[PDB]
Structure formats: C-alpha cells, structure tokens
Write a protein that binds this ligand. Structure first.
Ligand SMILES: [Mg+2]
Ligand SMILES: [Zn+2]
Ligand SMILES: [Zn+2]
Lengths: 304, 69, 44, 115, 98, 64
RNA sequence: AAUCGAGAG
C-alpha cells in the first residue's frame, strides 16, 4: 500500500547549496509526477511584478515606443510580490490601478552634447550627456499608502546595469510604466526564475573490474570528480554521481562496451533553481509547493 | 539592434553584460570564451546572446534628425 | 515650433498660407516634430 | 513593417489654378472627437495609433466650404512614424500640397509565419 | 464553474464518472492522477486535455465499488495536499538545519 | 437570424489546383480561440496534397 | 481596366 506516512518515511531533501539567487538541492523518493508539478509551478504559476502598462509622453530616440516598452517590461523589479495585490481587470481604467496593486516607475532623460569633451574623443559617455539609458534610471514614484509601506524597501531593478536605450543630443525619453502582479504562464516577463529544472541522479554501474591502466582511461571518460582509483587495489569506483554530466563518452570505446551500464535513479531529482532577483530561490520553491497545495484545496472545496 | 534584456531560451538577464563584455575584450586581453565565463554565462544559450550580438544601434544613432551634422 | 528642417535640422514654425521652406537655408523638406502626448503601450 | 503613403492635396488642381484645398480645419462645425488624432494644422501627431476609419489628414476645401478628412485604409493598426512636409521646387512660393506619412506596424511572429 | 461533472459519462450508481476542470493542465492533472492511482479501490484513472489551446482538463475515475468516483477524487486531492505539506515541512527542516 | 457559424455547421474545403473531387471535401467546423489560420488534421493532407509550409486553402460555407 | 515587374502553394 501507499500512504502519506509511507511517503513521509522515505522522502528526504539534501540542500547542496543556497545563495540569494541560486539554490541547488535534491528531492529523493518522490515521483516525477510531483517533481514536474513543482518545476512547472516555479516557471509559470509563481507570481512576480513586471512592467505592464507604459504611458509614453515623448520618445525621440532611435528605439521605437513598442520596443522600449517591451524592454521595460522585461527588466525584473525587486518587489516582494506579497506587498501588492492583484489587479481586477473588469474594473474601468480609471479605478483599475490603486496604491495597493500598482507600482509607478518613471523615466525622464534628455541627451545634451557635452561642451567639455576632448577633441578626438570617441567615447559616447564623454561626447554626450546621458548617451545611455539604464534600468537604474527608472525612478520609483510612490503614491498613496505605499509612500509609507515601501519606505522600508524602495523599488529598484534587480539589475540596474541593464542598458535600456541609447540617446543622442536633442533626443529624449519621457514615460511612465505601471507595474502589477502577473504570472509567467501569461507572459514570460512575470517568470521569477532564470531557469528552474531538475535532472535524475546518474547511475554508473561498473560491471567488471577495470584494474590497471584501463582505470586511468575509464576515469578519463567522465567529469574529473566522478571516478577515482582505489588506494588499496588499483580499481575504478564511482565517487560522486552528481558530478557526472551524462555524455556517454565511455560508450564510444569498445573497450568498456561491456564493462559499464549508464542509467539513472528514477526518484532522485537534483533541482537547480536560479532567481531573476525579486525573490530568493528557496522562497520560490516554497511558494510553488504552497501553490500546488492551495490549488488542490480549492478543488476539494469547490462544489461538484 | 540593442542588446536584449534577457536570454531567449532560459530567460537569464544578459542585458547588463554587453558593456562589461566589451570592456573585458578591450582592456583585458581576454578571448570570448573566457570573457563569457567570467561574466557568469555558462549555458551556451546565454553565451550565444552576447557572443553573437551585433549592436546596430550605434550605426543607427549616427543619423540624428535633431542635431546639425 | 512644430517642424524641423530636413538638412540643417533647425526648429521652425510654419504658419498657414506660408511658403513651405526652412527660413535659415533653402530646403523645401520639413519634418513634423513629435510633441508631448500620452501614448499607452503594453510591455509585451 | 514600415509603409509610407503620400497625401498629395494637389491632385484635383493643375497648372496655376488657385489652391482649392488647404491643409487644416476650417471655421465650420466639425466633430471635435477627431482632435485626438490630428494636430491643429490638419496633420497627425507623431506616435499616434491609427486604425480603420481613423482620420489621417484634415483639409479645408473652398469649393465646398467644408472641412474633410482623409482616413487610414488598412485593417492592420499602425503607428505614425514620421510626417514629411514636401514643398515644390518652383521658386514661386506656395502652401503645403504634399505631406508624406509613414506607418509602423508591429509584425510580431504569429502562428502561420514562415521561418 | 471550476469543477464540472460530465453527466453524459457518469454511471448511475456513481462508481464511474468523468470530471472537467477549467484552467488546469498537466501540472495538476498528472499529480492528481498519480495520487488517485494510489487508492486501492480505483480501477481506472487517467487525465486528458481535449485541446492544448483550451485550459480544460478531463479526469476519469472508475472504481471497483464500495466508493464513488467523487469520493476517490476527494481522497486523491486530500492525499495530494498532505504530500505537499510533508514536502514543505521537510524542506523547511533542512533549511533550518543547513 | 444570421447566426454565427457554430460547431454543428459544415464547411467545404478546397486547395488549388483541384485535380480530383477528393481535393474538395466536407468538414465539421470546430471553433478555436487563438489564431487566424485554418487547422487541418494530418490525414487530410493525402487528399488535399497539402503541406504546412505556406499552403492556403479555401473554406466555403453552405447557406441552405 | 489593361500592361509590366515581383512573388506563394
Ligand atoms: Mg504546399
Ligand atoms: Zn540562457
Ligand atoms: Zn534648414
């Protein structure tokens, strides 16, 4: 029989690393049906905040307005998604945006020629003033209660160095961007992960002994820290499977064609998660788990 | 024309690395693979986005209808 | 000032029933300037 | 996609006859609703979003004592890229009888496009 | 509106029904189907998406008896909730451990 | 009532050049929500001599 | 409306 208790006995997690952007960990004794659910929720269903509505007031630059709005929608914003609610689309445009669900960013930048530039200068930063527009130039314009709620943490891009646009003297950009909550299954700009995926733990079943110089070349067919030579007997053994990238270079030699079988542990998933910047990868994974549970609970409580 | 904000395949923000890539190519005498690795681009999907960018925006910008030439 | 000479790029105002030419130089091509207006977009 | 159309108000007249049609609005009573596509000189604002039947350029025709508009004829919405005023080479000074209008249409890859 | 019983496919005794779920895809379908196939009372279980361009999920549950397809669906949903709870708790334990 | 074409309607499809009557058949219309192309099953490609590399084909709506 | 030129299957 299968039971939640029998799953709780055998399931375990091995966090290999954890940063503010990337978290590498393991899920053991779980089914692909649930690991894939977690991965799909991380990529598509976990909400984040991105620029959606752009209100241009002037754009005399070479980049056209739709392209510039698309770029401004792509830049990730360091906003905690819980700090704002969801936009009610059915409401009219006047009352649709409010201080609890919309974040206003502005970008006003004019390019003027630098009258102190040296002769023979080819650097645009020395020839012109504001010849480059960066995501850091996206000022945050708090309105209403967010002037107090966001005082602890001002909204800035996760990558202020993103080169939004370039300018030349006389040219200018003046725009407002409205940032709301959305999910990545709608538009890829709301996806909060650079990439979240997994891979089964590789298995390297050595069938016959590889004693001798053959161990030197057999170990040469894998990533450096995967096969080792035993201190006692000159034998090859599997040190670390996680270090193996499955490239089957050993299979390309008929010497080992009947000495090793390459397989996988069909329940040992190595989740690698990277964050765009708005949330930590561990919190992304936690939110995906919670989303699956909450959607199941909504189905349970829905009348049939 | 101008560097893309994100990598097309995975979505990693690579729009803040074009100027650094040029700096590491010019000031440091780094080859393209070394510069891409030192920018943090490991997946070839992310490497291609910077390794193959053309940067036509600079050539577009020389035709300025708002300044005397 | 709502027009720009296509060659010398000097801003010039062209009144109605007036000769369509740059005042500074003799260029008969004028470019309409883009003035400040609200233009909504989707960041998609 | 970029498309340039040429509005040549000098189509009806020929060879030194008076200027029957002048760009802009007359002193008539025309709907104020089409002031959000056209400037006060009967030309479109740069960057506006045009569709089917939206005004493109207003002209005032004395032969009818009325203000008529030319409209955008395409089922694909576009954006005004640039408006070029063209003056004739003749040393006799005239008004504007030709504005060139440039359209920008967003060609996002759709299901059906060829790669 | 979220969950609908397809009457044309349900059985009179209720032991073989078919459910249409809106705004769902493989993510919930595969997990729910795997969890329901852990009930020793269900005979047949699977999920199908009629058209990929529509966000509609179909779940079929046929039981051997002594329960219904609705009861099997409820049990699978609750088991999925508990599975998520144990995953969350173990992940938090290992986070605090570190 | 000039009602819109529903899912219970039938349509006539044709790809030029019409070399034989199998290149003009009746189809039951299934209305999709997304695109602006006509979607065809693969088994009809043998009859229509059609491939999905730029081919377009007509869709006639009988009225009585 | 023709004529010419460019295309698609
Ligand atoms: Mg064909
Ligand atoms: Zn990438
Ligand atoms: Zn001039």
């Amino acid at each position: 029989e299968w039971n939640v208790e029998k799953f709780k006995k055998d399931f375990e997690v091995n966090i290999s690393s954890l940063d503010a952007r990337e978290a590498n960990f393991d899920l053991i004794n779980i089914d692909t049906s649930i690991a894939n659910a977690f991965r799909r929720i991380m990529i598509s269903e976990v909400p984040s905040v991105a620029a959606e509505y752009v209100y241009f007031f002037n754009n005399t630059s070479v980049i056209q307005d739709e392209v510039l709005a698309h770029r401004i929608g792509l830049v990730p914003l360091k906003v905690d998604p819980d700090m704002l609610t969801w936009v009610d689309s059915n409401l009219p445009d006047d009352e649709k945006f409010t201080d609890e669900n919309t974040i206003v960013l502005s970008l006003n930048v004019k390019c003027t020629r630098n009258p102190d530039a040296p002769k023979g200068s080819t650097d645009p930063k020395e020839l012109y003033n504001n010849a480059h527009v960066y995501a850091r130039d996206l000022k945050f314009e708090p309105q209403g209660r967010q002037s107090t709620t966001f005082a602890d943490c001002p909204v800035v891009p996760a990558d202020p160095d993103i080169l939004l646009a370039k300018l030349r003297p006389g040219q200018e950009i003046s725009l407002k961007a409205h940032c709301i909550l959305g999910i990545g299954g709608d538009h890829a700009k709301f996806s909060p992960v650079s990439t979240a995926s997994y891979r089964l733990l590789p298995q390297i079943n050595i069938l016959q002994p590889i004693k001798g110089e053959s161990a030197r070349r057999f170990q040469k067919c894998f990533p450096p820290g995967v096969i080792g030579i035993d201190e006692g007997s000159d034998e090859a053994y599997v040190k670390d499977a996680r270090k193996d990238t499955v490239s089957r270079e050993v299979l390309r030699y008929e010497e080992f064609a009947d000495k090793v079988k390459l397989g996988r542990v069909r329940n040992h998933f190595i989740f690698n998660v990277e964050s765009a910047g708005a949330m930590t990868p561990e919190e992304i994974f936690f939110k995906s788990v919670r989303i699956l549970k909450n959607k199941a609970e909504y189905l349970k409580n829905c009348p049939i | 024309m101008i560097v893309p904000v994100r990598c097309f395949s995975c979505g990693k923000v690579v729009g803040d690395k074009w100027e650094s890539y040029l700096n590491l190519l010019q000031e440091d005498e780094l080859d393209e693979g070394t510069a891409l690795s030192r920018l943090g681009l490991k997946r070839y999907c992310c490497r291609r986005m910077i390794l193959t960018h053309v940067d036509l925006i600079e050539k577009f910008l020389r035709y300025n209808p708002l300044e005397k030439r | 000032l709502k027009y720009i000479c296509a060659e010398c790029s000097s801003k010039l105002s062209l009144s109605r029933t007036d000769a369509v030419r740059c005042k500074d130089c003799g260029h008969r091509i004028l470019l309409k300037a883009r003035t400040k207006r609200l233009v909504q977009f989707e960041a998609r | 996609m970029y498309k340039t159309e040429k509005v040549d108000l000098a189509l009806n007249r020929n060879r030194g006859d008076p200027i029957t049609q002048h760009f802009g609005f007359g002193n008539d009573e025309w709907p104020k609703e089409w002031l959000e596509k056209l400037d006060e000189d009967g030309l479109p604002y740069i960057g506006t979003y045009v569709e089917e039947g939206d005004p493109i350029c207003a002209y005032f025709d004395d032969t009818l004592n009325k203000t008529k508009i030319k409209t955008y004829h395409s089922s694909e919405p576009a954006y005004i890229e640039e408006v070029n005023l063209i003056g004739d080479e003749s040393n006799k000074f005239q008004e504007l009888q030709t504005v060139s209008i440039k359209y920008r249409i967003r060609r996002t890859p759709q299901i059906g496009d060829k790669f | 509106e979220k969950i609908k019983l397809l009457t044309q496919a349900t059985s009179e005794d209720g032991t073989s029904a078919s459910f249409q779920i809106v705004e769902e895809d493989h993510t919930l379908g595969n997990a729910l189907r795997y969890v329901i196939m852990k009930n020793p009372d269900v005979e047949f279980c699977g999920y199908s998406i009629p058209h990929p361009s529509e966000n509609l999920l179909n779940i079929r549950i046929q039981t051997y008896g002594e329960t219904t397809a609705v009861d099997a669906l409820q049990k699978g949903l609750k088991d999925l909730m508990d599975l998520c709870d144990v995953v969350e708790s173990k992940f938090t334990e290992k986070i605090k451990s570190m | 009532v000039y009602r819109h074409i529903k899912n219970r309607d039938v349509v006539l499809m044709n790809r030029q050049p019409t070399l034989h009557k199998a290149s003009m058949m009746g189809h039951k219309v299934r209305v999709l929500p997304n695109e602006k192309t006509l979607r065809l099953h693969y088994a009809n490609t043998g009859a229509y001599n059609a491939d999905f590399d730029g081919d377009e084909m007509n869709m006639h709506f009988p009225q009585n």
